[PDB]
Paper text:
MarR TFs typically function as environmentally responsive repressors of genes encoding efflux pumps that export xenobiotics, including many antimicrobial agents, and are defined by the presence of a winged helix-turn-helix (wHTH) DNA-binding domain. SlyA has been best characterized in Salmonella enterica serovar Typhimurium, where it serves primarily to upregulate virulence genes. Although this contrasts with the classical repressive role of MarR TFs, work in our and other laboratories has demonstrated that SlyA positively regulates genes by a countersilencing mechanism, in which repression of AT-rich promoters by the histone-like nucleoid-associated protein H-NS is relieved by SlyA. Here we show that SlyA has retained an ability to undergo conformational changes in response to aromatic carboxylates, regulate gene expression in an environmentally responsive manner, and repress the expression of a linked drug efflux system.
To further analyze the mechanism of allosteric inhibition of SlyA, the structure of the salicylate-SlyA cocrystal was determined. Studies by other groups have previously determined the structure of apo-SlyA and the SlyA bound to DNA, demonstrating that SlyA is similar in overall structure to other MarR proteins, consisting of six alpha helices. Helices α1, α5, and α6 make up the dimerization domain, while α3 and α4, along with the wing region between α4 and α5, comprise the wHTH DNA-binding domain. Dolan et al. previously observed that the two recognition helices of the apo-SlyA dimer are only ∼15 Å apart, in a closed conformation. During interaction with a high-affinity binding site, the helices move a significant distance to accommodate the 32-Å distance between major grooves. SlyA, like other MarR family TFs, is subject to allosteric inhibition by small aromatic carboxylate compounds such as salicylate, which bind and stabilize the SlyA dimer in a conformation unfavorable for DNA binding. Our structural data indicate that SlyA binds a total of six salicylate molecules per dimer, at least four of which are likely to be biologically relevant. The analysis of these mutants indicates that both site I and site II bind salicylate in vivo and that both sites influence SlyA activity. Although the general structure and architecture of the salicylate-SlyA complex are similar to complexes formed by other MarR TFs, including MarR and MTH313 from Methanobacterium thermoautotrophicum, the various TFs differ significantly in their specific interactions with salicylate. MTH313 binds salicylate asymmetrically at sites similar to sites I and II of SlyA, binding only one salicylate molecule per monomer.
Numbering used by the authors:
A (entry chain A), B (entry chain A): 2 to 80, 89 to 141
Amino acid sequence: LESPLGSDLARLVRIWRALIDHRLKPLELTQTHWVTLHNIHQLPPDQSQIQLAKAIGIEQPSLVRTLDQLEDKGLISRQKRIKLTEKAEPLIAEMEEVIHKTRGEILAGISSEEIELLIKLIAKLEHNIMEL
Amino acid sequence: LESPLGSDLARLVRIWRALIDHRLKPLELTQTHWVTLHNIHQLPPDQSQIQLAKAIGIEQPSLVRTLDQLEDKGLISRQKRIKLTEKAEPLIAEMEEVIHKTRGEILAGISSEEIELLIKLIAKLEHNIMEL
Ligand SMILES: O=C(O)c1ccccc1O
Ligand SMILES: O=C(O)c1ccccc1O
Ligand SMILES: O=C(O)c1ccccc1O
Ligand SMILES: O=C(O)c1ccccc1O
Ligand SMILES: O=C(O)c1ccccc1O
Ligand SMILES: O=C(O)c1ccccc1O
């Protein structure tokens, strides 16, 4: 088709992130940090590095500086598997609450069956991509 | 809702970009560079800095290093308005061809009326976001 789908989506995702970044600044989480912690939070327990980078859609080595920092601030433990600490729990719970609440306002006036099709479509687009 | 829409989209967009990045590496365009040139290309002629950052969904100062480089390699001219040069034309045309062609393969088996709803939905999501 003619329509610039990938850059429409890429803009949307940038402005949605930027809204969240603003709302989370008091927590002085940077983008990369909350993105990565959120991702850890929505995965099941004990992810390998490799599962995490994949769920994010990035390549490990970029993941590693971000993880190293989080480990430095004691947010995260590794023994290569990944566990949120006791110490990150209040920070996470408040982060997730702002993210959840922002999603409810973003999703306002969009029907569940419309959101359900978006999700199934995202899936197919990604499958095409991975198949290449 | 419960569903992690923003990170689904953010993954999709990361893996779609990464596919394009791979395909464009022979041209040794970096991500930021092709993203920005593509954006310039799909806009009407002579954008201000400000229109460009907005179409991308970023804030000007990040835009500026990238533009400075492009101007250094003679891809781009400014007099604060922005014009692709004569010299960038073959590079652009080949870039756009790879992007266009990648979109056709990504969009395979998805109906036009389904792609048309995605586009209208992206629009509404962004409007909610800007309204905040
Ligand atoms: O601008 C982007 O980030 C982008 C991402 C995927 C496809 C096309 C694009 O312009
Ligand atoms: O792009 C990155 O470097 C990155 C690193 C960690 C988490 C999310 C990210 O996009
Ligand atoms: O909607 C707001 O005003 C807001 C501000 C910060 C965090 C979550 C929010 O909903
Ligand atoms: O992971 C992201 O980049 C992201 C972007 C917007 C909303 C939620 C997210 O996790
Ligand atoms: O995030 C950036 O710094 C950036 C800069 C120029 C173009 C696209 C971008 O995402
Ligand atoms: O599909 C491919 O093999 C390909 C490779 C590079 C550029 C555009 C493409 O379609």
